[PDB]
Design a protein around this ligand. Structure first.
Ligand SMILES: Nc1ncnc2c1ncn2[C@@H]1O[C@H](COP(=O)(O)OP(=O)(O)O)[C@@H](O)[C@H]1O
Ligand SMILES: [Mg+2]
Length: 404
């Protein structure tokens, strides 16, 4: 008795289905629910009918996920590949905050940084068809053109200025330009910023002190540092884009708990560690048993809400809790970073769930270890699993799948 996303109030479960469909994920920061449609974007209709006019009938996942949480005074990180639609995703929320605002002030209200001149000019244009109807200007600071034409922003608007970190710094220390009013900064593709040595020049641009946002495809340690030092209360949107090693054991029905004890006491793996189980009663029973082993375990269950469920996942990240027990429902959507080990105490009847639970261990790369317990009571999956292990022939040998 359910309606498949043709509902008015929705349910937390339904929201989770929503995200899983569009593949988007978020790290908790008291986050607002994502957009289904433009008609209540939180944006004014004069901007919406422009969104329609350009032919953007459908929101890209990054747009629907990033915009609603940007409309509130919170910084966001946009982990997404190029072509995601992320440009308009940071443009629209900027435009609505452009006016919350005068002509004569002289010194940009907002700044947009990009690794390449091509991007700076793409952002310029993509912004211009949104800005020109709104009656204000966007200026690109780029070389390779006549300087007189650049110095041409005569009415001295430049409510938004888009430029390379490496050329804007050129006009900054000489103080040929001022950021007295730049209280909104956007960092598109900080990947190739660092990949093209804009690190220190970018850091030079730290003036004024409100929102700052950051769209990338990746977060290497250089990029993560740049993030933490300048992003107050980060909100991390992510979009779904082999890694896993897939060790597998054959065992009796419940000798498996002693093996789990052995693994945990091996110390080979570093908490957080996720151990899945097919049955709820066995979920809470093994969790209590791991509690008796002295380990710090946290249970994520539907009786409580996201406010507390999120608190629990955060309680997993922050090291107050080490091991997590779960049913398939308990954490289909969860995205706890760099978990050392996925223990399938019971392999699920459906095969896609296995792929799903092991599918979340490496962000861009991790230990990716997944031990899966097996028996003859779970024979139906055996023939399938083998070939899927071959599909990820990388990182693992099935070694002993001589039967089905
Ligand atoms: N809401 C939308 N719906 C459909 N197409 C869009 C939307 N927003 C942007 N586009 C188009 O998608 C193309 C991809 O560009 P874009 O995704 O903005 O690059 P990036 O991912 O690097 O920001 C652009 O040419 C743009 O015209
Ligand atoms: Mg885009």
């Amino acid at each position: 008795h359910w309606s498949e996303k043709k509902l008015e109030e929705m349910k937390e479960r339904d929201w989770r289905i929503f995200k899983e469909n569009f593949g988007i994920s978020t790290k908790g920061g008291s986050i607002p629910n994502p957009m289904r449609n433009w008609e209540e974007s939180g944006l004014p209709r004069r901007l919406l009918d422009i969104v329609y006019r350009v032919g953007y009938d459908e929101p890209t996942p990054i747009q629907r996920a990033a915009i609603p949480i940007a409309l509130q005074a919170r910084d966001l990180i946009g982990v997404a590949v190029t072509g995601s639609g992320k440009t308009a995703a940071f443009l629209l929320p900027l435009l609505v905050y452009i006016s919350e605002e005068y002509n004569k002030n002289d010194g940009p209200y907002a700044l947009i940084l990009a690794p390449t001149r091509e991007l700076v000019q793409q952002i310029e244009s993509e912004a211009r068809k949104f800005a020109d109807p709104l009656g204000f200007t966007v200026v690109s600071i780029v070389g390779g053109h006549s300087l007189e034409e650049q110095a041409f922003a005569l009415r001295n608007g430049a409510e938004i200025i888009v430029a390379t970190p490496g050329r804007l710094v050129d006009c900054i220390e000489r103080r040929l330009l001022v950021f007295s009013q730049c209280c909104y900064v956007i960092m598109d593709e900080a990947d190739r910023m660092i990949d093209q040595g804009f690190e220190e020049p970018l850091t030079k641009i730290l003036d004024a002190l409100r929102q700052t946002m950051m769209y990338t495809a990746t977060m290497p340690p250089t990029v993560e540092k740049i993030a933490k030092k300048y992003l107050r209360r980060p909100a991390i949107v992510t979009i779904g884009n082999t890694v896993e090693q897939r060790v597998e054991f054959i065992a009796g029905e419940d000798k498996r708990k002693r093996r789990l004890q052995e693994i945990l006491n091996s110390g080979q793996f570093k908490p957080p560690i996720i151990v899945f189980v097919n049955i709820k009663r066995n979920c809470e029973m093994v969790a209590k048993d791991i509690k008796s082993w002295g380990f710090s375990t946290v249970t994520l269950h539907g009786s409580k809400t996201q406010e507390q469920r999120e608190a629990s996942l955060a309680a997993l990240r922050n090291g107050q809790a080490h091991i997590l027990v779960a049913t398939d429902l308990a954490g289909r959507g969860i995205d706890v970073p760099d978990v050392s080990l996925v223990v399938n105490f019971n392999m699920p009847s459906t095969i896609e769930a296995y792929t799903h639970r092991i599918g979340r261990t490496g962000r861009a790369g991790k230990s990716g270890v997944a031990i899966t317990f097996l028996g003859n009571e779970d024979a139906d999956v055996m023939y399938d699993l083998k070939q899927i292990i071959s599909k990820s022939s990388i990182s693992k040998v099935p070694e002993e799948l001589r039967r089905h």
